[PDB]
Amino acid sequence: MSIFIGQLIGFAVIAFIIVKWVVPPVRTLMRNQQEAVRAALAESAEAAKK
Amino acid sequence: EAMLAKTAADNRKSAEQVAAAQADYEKEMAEARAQASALRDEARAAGRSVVDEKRAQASG
């Protein structure tokens, strides 16, 4: 039972470290990819209009 | 990828057209100008011939 609380605390630490250091960069990369593809689509529309 | 290639080709084609429109413009501008100049030249030649034959018949 005690080991259960211990590994819950460990998982809380894991979640904190994740959300605080791994989440920001991966989210930024995801936003960069989304912006790049959106810009590509916008360029396609602009080129067709041109 | 096909969309990216199509966008590049469309930009290239728009650049080509903004030049080809003016190219054909100037081409038939020059065609009309040359035709008009030829019409004027033949009119002048006809007038010269007419006055020359008038000279000849009047002298006779």
From Swiss-Prot, chain A:
TM segment ranges: 3-23
Protein location: Cell membrane
Superkingdom of the organism of origin: Bacteria
Further comment: Binds 2-aminothiazole antibiotics, which are antitubercular agents.
Function (record text): F(1)F(0) ATP synthase produces ATP from ADP in the presence of a proton or sodium gradient. F-type ATPases consist of two structural domains, F(1) containing the extramembraneous catalytic core and F(0) containing the membrane proton channel, linked together by a central stalk and a peripheral stalk. During catalysis, ATP synthesis in the catalytic domain of F(1) is coupled via a rotary mechanism of the central stalk subunits to proton translocation. This fusion protein includes a component of the F(0) channel (subunit b) and of the F(1) subunit (subunit delta). Two copies of subunit b and one of delta together form the peripheral 'stator' stalk which links F(1) to F(0).
Subunit organization: F-type ATPases have 2 components, F(1) - the catalytic core - and F(0) - the membrane proton channel. F(1) has five subunits: alpha(3), beta(3), gamma(1), delta(1), epsilon(1). F(0) has three main subunits: a(1), b(2) and c(10-14). The alpha and beta chains form an alternating ring which encloses part of the gamma chain. F(1) is attached to F(0) by a central stalk formed by the gamma and epsilon chains, while a peripheral stalk is formed by the delta and b chains.
Protein family membership: In the N-terminal section; belongs to the ATPase B chain family.
Protein name, UniProt field: ATP synthase subunit b-delta
Species of provenance: Mycolicibacterium smegmatis (strain ATCC 700084 / mc(2)155) (Mycobacterium smegmatis)
Swiss-Prot record, chain B:
Main location class: membrane
Localization (cell): Cell membrane
GO-annotated cellular components: plasma membrane; proton-transporting ATP synthase complex
Keywords: ATP synthesis, Cell membrane, CF(0), Hydrogen ion transport, Ion transport, Membrane, Transmembrane, Transmembrane helix, Transport
GO terms of molecular function: proton-transporting ATP synthase activity, rotational mechanism; proton-transporting ATPase activity, rotational mechanism
Keyword Ribosomal protein included in the entry's annotation: no
Assembly with partners or alone: F-type ATPases have 2 components, F(1) - the catalytic core - and F(0) - the membrane proton channel. F(1) has five subunits: alpha(3), beta(3), gamma(1), delta(1), epsilon(1). F(0) has three main subunits: a(1), b(2) and c(10-14). The alpha and beta chains form an alternating ring which encloses part of the gamma chain. F(1) is attached to F(0) by a central stalk formed by the gamma and epsilon chains, while a peripheral stalk is formed by the delta and b chains.
Family from the record: Belongs to the ATPase B chain family.
Function (record text): F(1)F(0) ATP synthase produces ATP from ADP in the presence of a proton or sodium gradient. F-type ATPases consist of two structural domains, F(1) containing the extramembraneous catalytic core and F(0) containing the membrane proton channel, linked together by a central stalk and a peripheral stalk. During catalysis, ATP synthesis in the catalytic domain of F(1) is coupled via a rotary mechanism of the central stalk subunits to proton translocation.
Name of the protein in question: ATP synthase subunit b
Gene behind this protein: atpF
